[PDB]
Design a protein around this ligand. Sequence first.
Ligand SMILES: [Mg+2]
Ligand SMILES: [Mg+2]
Ligand SMILES: [Mg+2]
Ligand SMILES: [Mg+2]
Ligand SMILES: [Mg+2]
Ligand SMILES: [Mg+2]
Ligand SMILES: [Mg+2]
Ligand SMILES: [Mg+2]
Ligand SMILES: [Mg+2]
Ligand SMILES: [Mg+2]
Ligand SMILES: [Mg+2]
Ligand SMILES: [Mg+2]
Lengths: 396, 154, 112
Amino acid sequence: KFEHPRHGHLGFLPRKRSRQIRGRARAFPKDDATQKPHLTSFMVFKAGMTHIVRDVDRPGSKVNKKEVVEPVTILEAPPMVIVGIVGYRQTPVGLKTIGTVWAHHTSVEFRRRYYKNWKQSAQLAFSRQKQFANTKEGKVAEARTLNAFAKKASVIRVIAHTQLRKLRNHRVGVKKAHVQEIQINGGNVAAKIALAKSLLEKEVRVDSVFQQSEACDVCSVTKGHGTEGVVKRWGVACLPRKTHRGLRKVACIGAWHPARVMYTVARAGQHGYHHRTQLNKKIYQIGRSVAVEPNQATTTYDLTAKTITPMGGFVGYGTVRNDYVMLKGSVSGPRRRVMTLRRPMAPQTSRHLKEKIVLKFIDTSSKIGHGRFQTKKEKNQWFGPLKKDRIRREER
Amino acid sequence: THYSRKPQVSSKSAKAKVSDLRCHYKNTFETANVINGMPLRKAQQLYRQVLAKTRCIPFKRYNGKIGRTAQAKEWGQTKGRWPRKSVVAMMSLLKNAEANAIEKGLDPNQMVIKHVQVDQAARMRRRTYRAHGRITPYMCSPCHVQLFMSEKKE
Amino acid sequence: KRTGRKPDAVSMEATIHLSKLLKKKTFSKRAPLAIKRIKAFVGRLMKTKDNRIDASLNTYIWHKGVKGVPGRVRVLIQRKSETTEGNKHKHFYTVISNVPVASFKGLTTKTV
RNA sequence: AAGUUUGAAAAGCACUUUGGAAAGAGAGUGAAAUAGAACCUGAAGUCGUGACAAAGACAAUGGAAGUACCUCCAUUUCAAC
RNA sequence: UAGAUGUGGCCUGGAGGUUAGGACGAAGCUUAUGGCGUGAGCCUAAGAUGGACCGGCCUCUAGUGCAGAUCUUGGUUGGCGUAGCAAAGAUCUAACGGAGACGUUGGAUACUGGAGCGGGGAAGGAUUUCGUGCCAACGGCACUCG
RNA sequence: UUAAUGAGAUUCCCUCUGUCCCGAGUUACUAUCUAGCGAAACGACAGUCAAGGGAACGGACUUGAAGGGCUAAGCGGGGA
RNA sequence: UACGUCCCUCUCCAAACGAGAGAACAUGCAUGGGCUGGCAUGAGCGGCCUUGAGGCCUGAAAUUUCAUGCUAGGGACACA
Ligand SMILES: [Mg+2]
Ligand SMILES: [Mg+2]
Ligand SMILES: [Mg+2]
Ligand SMILES: [Mg+2]
Ligand SMILES: [Mg+2]
Ligand SMILES: [Mg+2]
Ligand SMILES: [Mg+2]
Ligand SMILES: [Mg+2]
Ligand SMILES: [Mg+2]
Ligand SMILES: [Mg+2]
Ligand SMILES: [Mg+2]
Ligand SMILES: [Mg+2]
């Protein structure tokens, strides 16, 4: 008889706190040995959002026509320092690591990750591996396992961490290094270590991994809300105003049989702070740093000079100082939470996902307000030498 | 009659009691058992930090829906509290048994709390008042606390 | 007691921005919790927890009623003593008082 | 409801000192304080800590049958049946 | 099973007989104290239990055996340090007292708002008044206060 | 049959709105944590399921399937 | 007596409490300046509008960069 479509999605149970804030790709793309060895993932930090105006393509009705305002997300992406190389056997109980070569140097932020205090400690992390690397048996026991990553290995995963001393953001209160294994999806695993062995202990910047107009998948950890009730966690319904013992509940959570509450009925508990993936988030610009190009947000039709950082920074994040990546739309983070990009799974051959992009406008109007001004040198033009600077720029 | 266990050396030992310790048996239980092998100075150091609420009393056996806390991990648990009245009531019972260690000639800086023992007293009565005219009990449940000490030869 | 006993009877005249410490707190508890988060303010300011209030700081925080509290308070912190030593002592208290200032834009933390 | 029926005798714990005083630890009384006034005996129930098989939970208990180790419990041999 | 019956058969209180214990420790009580009776039960030991009564046997006698009656009474226990102590006025500070959150005084901000947390009475209560102590248990938190 | 009256019963219309579409944010007070205090109703034992049989809708039986332990906040399916 | 972890404090992408993410001379904290943004022309004064997009507020359950100020290091197991 009467019914409705079921509330919430059973394929995101249990609604549980993710085991770490670090967004972590559960699966990397299928290894097409017909490609070149490359890096298929990258960790960025969610700065915040803004929106942009685009010259549209893909002839439809709202397309092949005047521009469009589409909301975007700014993800600050400093270059990642590769430290290790990790290979896996394809054994009948699923992949298993067959060793891990490290670099000879290992940044002081990486070694913090193997601690939880690091300032009362004695900093012995990787002490007998720096020493033993300078040995000869070290070089033996290192090429003995690199000559293994070709015999036994199929999956080769460098270990990259983030540069945070290169991320002058303070509101990212952490000084450890976020450590992430990254798949290499080239071919001829012999030539797959060759990449890994090469870029080891070298910085990997995000445009080396990704290109501008193509889409990624964003492994991330949702913004947490603590214990949310049934109406907020599952979005079931509110009982009528007349209800006793209140109305933000599921009335019937079980028949007489089965005489147990089902895993399908809605209950209150952890909402948010879940690991999500957000397939097919399309990059619109992968612009470089202000230290190298202090004209981030001025493409061709905003011949003024400006940067991505809005007037007064991104709210609750700061200024973007590094190789930001501009996606399209939502990303399952709060500000300054590490996001992991990933090259996508989908066939991606479409006139709605493989089309190239030019951005005719970006908004740097302040997040903190309403903002009516781009590029604060426009605000000074609206006003005059008002009494704040008048009491300083006329008192000399 | 005295004293469930004898200190196995009577001159190298102090002894102290209370009989009507005026507060909950259940809060006083773990307040006491938490220091049951500790040196005397490491036991006052515990209680005097339970009162500043930097270490807790790990409620065993009478935890029963007390809240979880971070300060109880050292005790190998999740539950624990900071019972002020039961801790200040054994700050006093310990400093008594100090005074029994000087009285015999024993450095209290050598005293080990061997065999604390808390149990239940006569359970005073003062009715309270329920709905519909039902006069229910409101027992107070005092407690006895025993403990003796000893030394540890170098 | 490196920077604690090195000075004797300090006096720093420091601003305590209070709207930052009392935001969306219940109005009925706002003038009491104003007092209480100056204790644990000037405590962290001088590594001691025995903080008195010199009845002009108190009269000030309460002058706008229990609900109305000034946004900032400029405070003169006296740390006098009975001169103890060692450890776990009591002889470092504080004689926190108010300062009529009539303005707060420009004045940093001072001393004496 | 309620035998304070402590002890033969109040000899009812002087006194020292820890505690602000209670109470505690000592002494001391007496045949017993392990008879300290809420006192003859002091049970069950429940609880406490000390020990342990220190066992080991995947209802408890129990039945039969063994075994492990431990039991001043019985008996017997302890130059012999 | 309902029932019937037997038992040189078991057990409790007491009587008439007999035999006999007991301050060199009786009743009682405890039990990984064994043994011995199919069993009811009995006997022993050992108590860092108890302190003054009492066992066996033959008859007599009855207020004579308890797990279960929404049994009765007393006591304890779980749930459980749990529900809660959420209507009605927000205490804040100095220095003072104190064995110590408490009280007192000062100042501060308040609340009652003259149909009052006012001042007087009747009904009713009858020392609750007052002062000085006190702080054991009572004032559902605490108290140096009541 | 009736004017007036109605915490009467009833229907429509107007206004008005969170009654609702469809919910969302805020606030005290609680719940939550703590110090102090502290009950009770209830209580055979208990206490994971499916199927079977059964006083015919089992917590214990039968046969399978799960189940390490102890936990805090919830909820209201069951414990006929 | 080791490497370390934990508590206490602080921070807040986390949070009912645990747990989490952190820091532990760091831009850490606190002020101030600047930016950004709210409001809409401040007490006072000159001749009511003028000073004047003024004054005030702006990180605080916790907007953003610059100057100056102070800035526990103690515990608990690990550990025998
Ligand atoms: Mg109703
Ligand atoms: Mg009779
Ligand atoms: Mg009868
Ligand atoms: Mg009976
Ligand atoms: Mg019964
Ligand atoms: Mg019942
Ligand atoms: Mg559970
Ligand atoms: Mg529960
Ligand atoms: Mg916070
Ligand atoms: Mg952590
Ligand atoms: Mg400022
Ligand atoms: Mg801050």
